[PDB]
Write a protein that binds this ligand. Structure first.
Ligand SMILES: COc1c(/C=C/C(=O)c2ccc(O)cc2)ccc(O)c1O
Ligand SMILES: COc1c(/C=C\C(=O)c2ccc(O)cc2)ccc(O)c1O
Ligand SMILES: [Zn+2]
Ligand SMILES: [Zn+2]
Lengths: 176, 176
């Protein structure tokens, strides 16, 4: 039954100095329809589209979303790429051209065989106010705030059905 | 042929004030064996274990990793949960107890059918130096920096086989 705190921490090395400037920059998800996905992440969740890359040979596009003030995005192309790819906590959406037109195609959300990735998670000031608004907007839920044993935590789904955790960090010390 | 720049932006909404303090707090991956995972993410990648939660009735644990200075971790348990779950860009590792003693179980990395999730990525000052060190330490690679078309970009594998991009933001314009 799992590692104790002490045992887990025994498994943790200090950071080599060579890694001291490393940052966790992106999480990449493939999206069926980038129009729907852009609309959800910006209008529903209040992210900003900070960069778009197209690769006509490989027939895909990349869309980088972040919680960033659009007024901070550099105007010049090279500058813009360097800035967006050095932001922490970006969402990279990959659009393989032609999926949005293919009724037989969908992506897998990791939460059923074969499992792996589970979710991204958004910290909000208030899970119940955020979720009321998501409800007014027609968002699909996996788990409402008062559903289940883990009250005060929610899961919604994006247009591909990827799961997104809605957590309030300042309430969460009544859970462990 | 994928979206135009104009058509992409046209599907973007400004951020509703209800989202003004939202942040992208976590990516969750499921891990077969936390002992290997914690060693990798801390010793190899230089992350810090900032919080561990255990759920003995549901038989799992959560491990929160992040690029944070271990001297910023609050000393007190409840403040620590609130600080840790309000950090941007955490990796959340879920260990369902028992997987690590099951030769018939393995997690899927999302890069073979059925695809969805693709990878996380770490921005680094120096892709080649980082990956020389990874090689020294026995790390498994999907793509060495000089392999294939996209020179100067790498993908490594974690203990469960999740792909991790290794990029230098300031070469990603140049490397044309
Ligand atoms: C996906 O991450 C990247 C890529 C690379 C993207 C791909 O090669 C890709 C194409 C189709 C697919 O199904 C999955 C991946 C290229 C540059 C870059 O900065 C970056 O972050
Ligand atoms: C959702 O991840 C959490 C959880 C709880 C749940 C999971 O991580 C999860 C595990 C297995 C699965 O198949 C789906 C989801 C509980 C508290 C918390 O802060 C947090 O981030
Ligand atoms: Zn990427
Ligand atoms: Zn989570």
């Amino acid at each position: 039954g799992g590692l104790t705190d002490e045992a887990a921490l025994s498994c943790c090395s200090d950071a080599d100095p060579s890694t001291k400037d490393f940052l966790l920059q992106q999480t990449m998800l493939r999206v069926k329809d980038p129009k729907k996905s852009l609309d959800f992440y910006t209008r529903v969740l209040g992210m900003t589209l900070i960069q778009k890359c197209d690769f006509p040979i490989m027939k895909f596009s990349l869309y980088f979303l972040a919680y960033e003030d659009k007024n901070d995005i550099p105007k010049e192309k090279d500058e813009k790429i360097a800035w967006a790819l050095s932001r922490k906590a970006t969402l990279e959406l990959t659009h393989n051209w032609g999926t949005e037109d293919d009724e037989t195609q969908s992506y897998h959300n990791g939460n059923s065989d074969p499992r792996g990735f589970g979710h991204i998670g958004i910290a909000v000031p208030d899970v119940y106010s955020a979720c009321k608004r998501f409800e007014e907007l027609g968002v699909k839920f996996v788990k409402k705030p008062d559903d289940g044993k883990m009250k005060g935590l929610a899961f919604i789904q994006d247009p591909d059905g990827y799961w997104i955790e809605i957590l309030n960090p300042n309430k969460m010390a009544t859970l462990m």
